[PDB]
């Protein structure tokens, strides 16, 4: 079984970044103003580490 690896909680602090590409992909980020995990549309490329596939993953990581 796979041991837990150390996580970088500063990854929750970036602004949401849709990136430059034009796909329509639902992702989640921790919003440092509202202090809540929120949905945003990701274009499929680039961005930053404040990008989670599901709300619960964002909540587990960031709240």
């Amino acid at each position, epitope marked *: 079984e796979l041991p837990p690896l150390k996580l970088m909680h500063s*990854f929750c602090a970036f602004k949401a970044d849709d990136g430059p590409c034009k796909a329509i*992909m639902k992702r989640f980020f921790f919003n440092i103003f509202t202090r809540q995990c929120e949905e945003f549309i990701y274009g499929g490329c680039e961005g930053n580490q404040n990008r989670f596939e599901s709300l619960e993953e964002c909540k587990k*990581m960031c709240t």
Partner: antibody
Amino acid sequence: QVQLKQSGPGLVQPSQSLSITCTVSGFSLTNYGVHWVRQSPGKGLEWLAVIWRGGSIDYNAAFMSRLSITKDNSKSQVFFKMNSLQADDTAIYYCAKNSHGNYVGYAMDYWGQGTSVTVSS
Amino acid sequence: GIVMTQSQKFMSTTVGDRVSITCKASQSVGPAVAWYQQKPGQSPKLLIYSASNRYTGVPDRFTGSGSGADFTLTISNLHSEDLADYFCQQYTSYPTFGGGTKLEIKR
């Protein structure tokens, strides 16, 4: 014990498609993303894309329009396809497990054995 | 994308010595840097993640250091089995890799 075993033919004629199957064991595709990276003498290691546990994909913008990544969780299989290969796509292609579950921003801890791809007529 | 530069393509080393491999990012990447080891014919192996964390089972003679744009992998006591290629990697906007540093034996 984690393993990623690649299968699929590596000889590709000009502008044809490359298809590789990555069959994983020791972990679930329901819990981990799987990356695709290639390595060539000319361009070194180049990351291409990752398929996350719920099927969402992040792409390298330079390859996005000719990449198709799918998977079958039940069979522990990820399917990589790249269209219209050119001579400069000759490289070793790897699948690799995301180190940190379903999270962006870390590393790739277990790698497939690689597929040597030759683009030539 | 971010460019990771390893200025030393080749380093000549001696068993038992300390060896330091440098990597510079074209702009700040914070701590999101990993190091890999690779030998001919084989796939990369992960040594270090998040700049300074040893991966599972990696010998404790490997240390990663650095933040921002400058990163260093140090082997405190080079073993023969450490002769290999070493690559840095950042994962901010997307993963990119350094060009590699190959250790060789001085003779």
